[PDB]
Design a binder for these strands. Sequence first.
DNA 1: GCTGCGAGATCCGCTCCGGTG
DNA 2: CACCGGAGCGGATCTCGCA
DNA 3: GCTGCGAGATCCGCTCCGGTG
DNA 4: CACCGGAGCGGATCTCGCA
Lengths: 275, 256, 275
Amino acid sequence: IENIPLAEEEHNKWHQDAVSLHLEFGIPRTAAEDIVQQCDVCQENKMPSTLRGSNKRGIDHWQVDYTHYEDKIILVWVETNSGLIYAERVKGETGQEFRVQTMKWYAMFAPKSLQSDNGPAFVAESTQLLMKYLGIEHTTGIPWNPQSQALVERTHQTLKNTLEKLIPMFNAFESALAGTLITLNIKRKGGLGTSPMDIFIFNKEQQRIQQQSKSKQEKIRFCYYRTRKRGHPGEWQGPTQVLWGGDGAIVVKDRGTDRYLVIANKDVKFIPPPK
Amino acid sequence: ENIPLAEEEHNKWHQDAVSLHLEFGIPRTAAEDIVQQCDVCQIDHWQVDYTHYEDKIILVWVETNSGLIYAERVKGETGQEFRVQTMKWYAMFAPKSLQSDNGPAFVAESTQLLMKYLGIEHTTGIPWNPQSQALVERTHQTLKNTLEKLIPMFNAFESALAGTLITLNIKRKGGLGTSPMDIFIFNKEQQRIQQQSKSKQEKIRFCYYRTRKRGHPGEWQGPTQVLWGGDGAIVVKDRGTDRYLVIANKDVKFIP
Amino acid sequence: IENIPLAEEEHNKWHQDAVSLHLEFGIPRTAAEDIVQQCDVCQENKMPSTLRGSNKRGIDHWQVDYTHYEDKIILVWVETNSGLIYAERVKGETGQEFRVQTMKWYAMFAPKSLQSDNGPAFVAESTQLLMKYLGIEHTTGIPWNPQSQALVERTHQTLKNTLEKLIPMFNAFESALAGTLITLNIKRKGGLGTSPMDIFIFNKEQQRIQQQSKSKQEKIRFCYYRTRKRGHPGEWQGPTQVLWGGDGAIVVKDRGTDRYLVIANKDVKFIPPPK
DNA sequence: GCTGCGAGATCCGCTCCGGTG
DNA sequence: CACCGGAGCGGATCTCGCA
DNA sequence: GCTGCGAGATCCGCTCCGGTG
DNA sequence: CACCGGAGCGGATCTCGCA
């Protein structure tokens, strides 16, 4: 532990990873990793390997991107939760044409939110106003990050493959595109052999708001909750409603965190209802 | 299965297939079959018409029962454009039957060949059903009135048509607040469930059936055709009573 | 099973994967996969996802590639088994200069075989004769496949990083390159904290041929062997020497396969030695 | 008759030690 | 005295980008 | 105040059925 | 009668390349 200054000097001179230094001078690897963190050259030359994710979100939250196939502009519209897709060819990527396509889209379906990249048509102020005009949240992804729209990119690849497989069988490129839409919307099935269109229909049936509104008549009970650390709980903090009661646990909301949280039934006491 | 009970109730009261499946939760196709077989009373059915408005030709697609409608501007009335429109329409929906008049585009040989390729029933001739015809004229009048209503506000003619489609499919409501889109979605969901549960499994198969009296099995009767084979039970008709009964698969001899 | 012709017709028309067809028409998925195999469009558009490998080989089997750093030509020499490396800068990639570098290399170490890409210096007939002149096997990798020399590519990346980290501390670029060689040959240690140079030295000590030659005096025994299929063995095929005897199994060579093979001691009968 | 791999960074599984009821 | 993280040790696992 | 995923192809783990000692 | 692949079923796992 007394050789730590010499280890730091060697790190400054040569800049090897902490594992070798730990195995050599017998210093805990936490100290060596902190040395690497507090150094300069290794800090400047280390790489940020992170996993991140994708915005699957919920029902009716879609994103889109353009298609460059055979020097023809095509719009492909992709669902995230169920997996449905839809596409149509357009002469250009102009704002007015994009607005017309979006209006037809919103006539056909009932979306809620839309994601997109920094494309001029997507970013256009009139398009943003129209999206606001129909009460739909429009968020722009960070520029030069196709992984945000990786879903539409994957669907793009699959649709191009299906066009390659299906184009010579029909007279019209639009007809072939419709056939590929059928292939990837009704025929493309996996797992339980259920179409993305069927998933979307079932999602709409569940999302029907009449049942959700009328479920309010169910009995509501109150309770306290506490947090467990090393098996040692805290105080019974705050009265909150029993959102649902399960076997061995319930569902509660913490106003401090403003998010949903689960507590085992052992740390829960039931409040009797009015009588 | 409550389907044979529904069919007995139909043999008693002779109500329409609509109220039948609404109030007994039975297949729409089964209700149509029962209406067809019931001589007292004797899905995805569409009608297509052409109409001009500022000298523009537009396809009109109206479903005969739920009331959902669809429209799209077209350059001309000729067969190739009709084929493209019907290809897009079949891409967007999953129809089962179509009713139309004797228009050249409808009666074109290649159009009917592509109908057969898609495997859907096509019927041409003079429309004789007031139930569908009057709905067609009502849809036409309402659509033209709403488009005259909404055109000045919108920049694009196609945008105005899309807005009128929104008004006539989502905003407009009837009964307990059910849109044509809502009723179409409900019927489509139930129809697809019953199709995947009953249709593709087996067809036109005969069998032997027996009736249990206080648990005692009866003599094998028939033979009769298996019309609706479900989970652990089938629907067959007793010839004497002209009624359908629930017979468990353990009491059925499958005739090859 | 009678719907197979219709399934084949649908495959010819639309060309979806076998899983969906199997889940739809209730046909065994082997038949559908064979249909896809015997079709044409899916055969033409399927992708060959294979894993392959790398030629780690044994001791003293190396490969090399050139370095394009700061518009300066550098030769980097990489070991595969132990992990040692060595490098030196050269003005150009000419055949004579490469021959001089190889001769210095063979003076410094005692290699056995060398791998390389389609580089003109590596492919030169005089270089091949010189490699033959020193009794070293030279094989050329398939062109335009850097994954064959992925080892030297990885070492290239690491050495460039270490140059970036170490260049300003020395006057001469050659001195910095030597320092990076020290870093990656003596300091870069993992696992048991043992240097690649130490691994190479121990490999040479083990590969010393005197012990291998003098091990022949060990007793040699003969035996038969058989192959097990479903628990049913065959005939006792061929007399072969007991190369080594272990606990529950031995080592034998099959002249039919001309490779080494292991048989459990249960299927082995010991031949008594001469007495 | 031939051939993708490894530095680097957090997280976690874990085991003696700890607080902890 | 049982129990769970705490810390240390060791291993498991992710993208990336070199040619 | 934000965000890589999924068609496609072999191999394998496995469970009733089989040969098999 | 125990035992191991055989075949079928289902799941586990690999690179790649789309923008």
